[PDB]
């Protein structure tokens, strides 16, 4: 019986009756300086968390930040140096990286790779699975997050999947349902690369409603303990370190 403020960016707000499973309220804030501030709110999934991400992409500076809480309408109320760049303006892909000083003793240097919104992002912040780094890749996805807390520890060439060597481990890849997307006739072997040698299976909920979702591929150990990387909500992951042990049993 949780309720949250549901506001669009235009300012139109209204009370929202949370659906089963969404026991948290969220306020997502985006700030674009050169300033413009976007605010959005609604009920959200149980495993969401407070997170920040700031990065400069040339002259601009984008600051994303999401706060969560689990009380009725709690929704209503209002220097570590890192390297920063972005895909929007080919900042990263062009090696035109810049120094950005975090403005929260909790913000670490981040390096996030999202290959089929920005493919490459670097800056300040704190995200789920921060302390350390994690990675995953399958027939059509490559995700990697690096979070560290030492001056410009997120510097260097941008990480591409092609620059990670095949390690020999082979895992099955697929996406969808166990009947549609992840069937014995749809799933196939891929070559795991670099540190990703865990054959993973993630089952949860994607799409609008509670559609059962599933994804299989190669992953780092740190991934076998969230769903934002797989676009899911309640994620249940399973891992094994034997080639093909990933198969729909």
């Amino acid at each position, epitope marked *: 019986s949780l309720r949250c403020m549901q506001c669009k960016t235009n300012g139109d707000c209204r009370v929202e009756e949370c659906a089963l499973g969404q026991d948290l309220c969220r306020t997502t804030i985006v700030r674009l300086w050169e300033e413009l501030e976007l605010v959005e709110k609604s009920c959200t999934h149980s495993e969401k968390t407070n997170r920040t991400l700031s990065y400069r992409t040339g002259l601009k500076i984008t600051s994303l930040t999401e706060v969560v809480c689990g009380l009725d309408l709690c929704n209503q109320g209002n220097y570590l140096e890192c390297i920063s760049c972005g895909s929007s303006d080919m900042s990263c892909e062009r090696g035109r990286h810049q120094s950005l000083q975090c403005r929260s003793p909790e913000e670490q240097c981040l390096d996030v790779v999202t290959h089929w919104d920005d493919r490459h992002l670097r800056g300040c912040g704190y995200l789920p699975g921060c302390p350390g780094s994690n990675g995953f890749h399958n027939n059509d996805t490559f995700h990697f997050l690096k979070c560290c807390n030492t001056t410009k520890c997120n510097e260097g060439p941008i990480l591409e999947l*092609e*620059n990670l*060597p095949q*390690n*020999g481990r082979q895992c099955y890849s697929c996406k969808g349902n166990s009947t549609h997307g992840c069937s014995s006739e749809e799933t196939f072997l891929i070559d795991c690369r670099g540190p990703m*040698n865990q054959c993973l299976v993630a089952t949860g909920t994607h799409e609008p409603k509670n559609q059962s979702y599933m994804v299989r591929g190669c992953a780092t*150990a740190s991934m076998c303990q969230l769903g934002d990387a797989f676009s899911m909500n309640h994620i249940d992951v399973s891992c094994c*370190t034997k080639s093909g042990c990933n198969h729909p049993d």
Partner: antibody
Amino acid sequence: GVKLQQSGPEVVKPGASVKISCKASGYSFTNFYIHWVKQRPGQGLEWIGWIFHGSDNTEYNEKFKDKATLTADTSSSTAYMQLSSLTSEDSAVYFCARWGPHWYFDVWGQGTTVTVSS
Amino acid sequence: DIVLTQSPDITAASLGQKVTITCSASSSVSYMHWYQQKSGTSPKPWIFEISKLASGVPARFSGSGSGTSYSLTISSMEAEDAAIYYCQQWNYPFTFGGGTKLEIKR
């Protein structure tokens, strides 16, 4: 600082088994792959296989799948390699090497000499 | 199984002579490394990620290549450069080339 310490030379009888160690120090053992390489007298280098974090995560060279067994004692940051049913073809120097940051075997153990003899 | 062929097999180079060792690959490999070995002791990383020199490697050494062909070159052959050089694919099979024995011509 960072090094791989291998066990001493071994003289083993044909048909028997041998297990050699590679103690890692100077870095986080569980975050890097350890490879094993064989080199017979006067010959080239052959990759045997690798281990990552523990005995349950290994990959082998098809040719050694029935000769070598890679394990690890995470509590002591040590990797082990067992070779069984030794013949004269197994007399060689065996090296352990770390697959470093830039993906090349960057740190090598000094090698362990295995002499299969009666 | 990507086959790596090193050539020359064995060569004698006079001091100050230009030496070029090549590694031919059965199929494309994104990166190739080169290790130097003397007296059967631990091979020493020499050139990695095709052309980066390991700490301590003299400037006379350089490596280059792409896809199926890579080469290590020493602009001016010196005495301490006599050794066996092995190329190696950076990925999964981690296969080493047959090796090239470089000796001093005299």
